[PDB]
Design a protein around this ligand. Structure first.
Ligand SMILES: COc1ccc(Br)cc1S(=O)(=O)Nc1cc2c(C)noc2cc1OCC(=O)NCCN1CCOCC1
Length: 133
């Protein structure tokens, strides 16, 4: 038989939502600090780049990624959520950062470069969080 299963192909899942008109939202001093201080400092860090967009499993040749990671999150998504006033409180935003870091630790192993990057960003995150208003 001449069907060699070369199609259909893989793909990335749809990215996490950054808008949801029926979701409850507020502006708070804690959320303004999360955008102004926490996000924007991590975003400029030299270790930010792997976390600035959803994991592109096709481009990065990580065909197992979305087999393993079922609640993806990234800083591009968090940044859009903060700019769009998506959140109701600081906790919702902090949980997204926690998810992002945890996903990296789940997928990879201690001492991997990507894990070193996440650990460093997480340390900076936890420092900035300790001065939340
Ligand atoms: C080799 O890829 C990387 C190595 C160090 C770093 Br810092 C970043 C990358 S990457 O190109 O951004 N890929 C990559 C991204 C993420 C994110 C985001 N979270 O977890 C990740 C893991 C990543 O790469 C893991 C890795 O082992 N990639 C090579 C997989 N190879 C498998 C067989 O050979 C061809 C490709």
């Amino acid at each position: 038989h001449h069907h060699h299963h070369l199609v259909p192909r893989g793909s990335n899942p749809p990215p996490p939502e950054t808008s949801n008109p029926n979701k409850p939202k507020r502006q708070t001093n804690q959320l303004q600090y999360l955008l102004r201080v926490v996000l924007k400092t991590l975003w400029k860090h030299q270790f930010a780049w792997p976390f600035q967009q959803p994991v592109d499993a096709v481009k990065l040749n990580l065909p197992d990624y979305y087999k393993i990671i079922k609640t993806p999150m990234d800083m591009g998504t968090i940044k859009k959520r903060l700019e769009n006033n998506y959140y109701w409180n600081a906790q919702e935003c902090i949980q997204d950062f926690n998810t992002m870091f945890t996903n990296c630790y789940i997928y990879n192993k201690p001492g991997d470069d990507i894990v070193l990057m996440a650990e460093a960003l997480e340390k900076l995150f936890l420092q900035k969080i300790n001065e939340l208003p």
